[PDB]
Amino acid sequence: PKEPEQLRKLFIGGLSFETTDESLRSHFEQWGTLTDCVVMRDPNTKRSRGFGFVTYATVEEVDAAMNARPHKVDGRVVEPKRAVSHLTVKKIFVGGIKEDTEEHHLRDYFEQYGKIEVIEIMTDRGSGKKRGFAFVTFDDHDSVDKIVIQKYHTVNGHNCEVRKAL
């Protein structure tokens, strides 16, 4: 069974207006099989709108392409992003971690999604007791995008609610 097509797409902004279906494809085929590759254009002038998308055969290929950023395509650094259910943020809210979850639990789990810069385990302003949620800040938005499309996150035995923050 193939992963849903929506999860295999990269939406690419910042294209050179000279980039074509063919040159976008030749670039991004370096990181996987492309089942689709389109540059968006004006319907009357055919002038590029400056963005397009590609569709890989697997999610691992999307990962490979995203790990190969920055992408310079036809002389211009472009901006690829995956689809989320774009709100481009580097921080997540992690809820449901109760009082026994520590920083290393969150680090050990989330470090495989991306490079962590901040872990903030939330505590009560009056008592100092843990409140049962945390925020994790990464150095880049793709980590967050990968995280929030998962159906499940289990951290320290807890089923966690994870969403984009601010």
Residues that bind ligand O0M (CB under 6 A): 11, 13, 40, 51-53
Closer to ligand O0M by Cβ: residue 79 or 120? 79
Distance CA 5, CA 22 (A): 21
In the complex, the smallest distance separating the C-beta of residue 48 from ligand O0M, rounded to whole angstroms, is: 11
Q: What are phi and psi of 77, to 5 degrees?
A: -75, 120
In the complex, the smallest distance separating the C-beta of residue 102 from ligand O0M, rounded to whole angstroms, is: 37
Cis omega before residue 4 (within 30°)? Answer: no
Closer to ligand O0M by Cβ: residue 97 or 142? 142
Closer to ligand O0M by Cβ: residue 40 or 77? 40
Paired residues of 51 in beta bridges: 13
Distance CA 9, CA 129 (A): 43
In the chain, which residues are followed by a C-to-N distance beyond 2.5 Å, i.e. a gap?
Answer: 85
Closer to ligand O0M by Cβ: residue 11 or 135? 11
In the complex, the smallest distance separating the C-beta of residue 165 from ligand O0M, rounded to whole angstroms, is: 21
In the complex, the smallest distance separating the C-beta of residue 74 from ligand O0M, rounded to whole angstroms, is: 16
Distance CA 96, CA 65 (A): 32
In the complex, the smallest distance separating the C-beta of residue 50 from ligand O0M, rounded to whole angstroms, is: 7
> Which pair of tokens denotes residue 6?
């929506």
Q: What are phi and psi of 145, to 5 degrees?
A: -60, -45
Closer to ligand O0M by Cβ: residue 36 or 139? 36
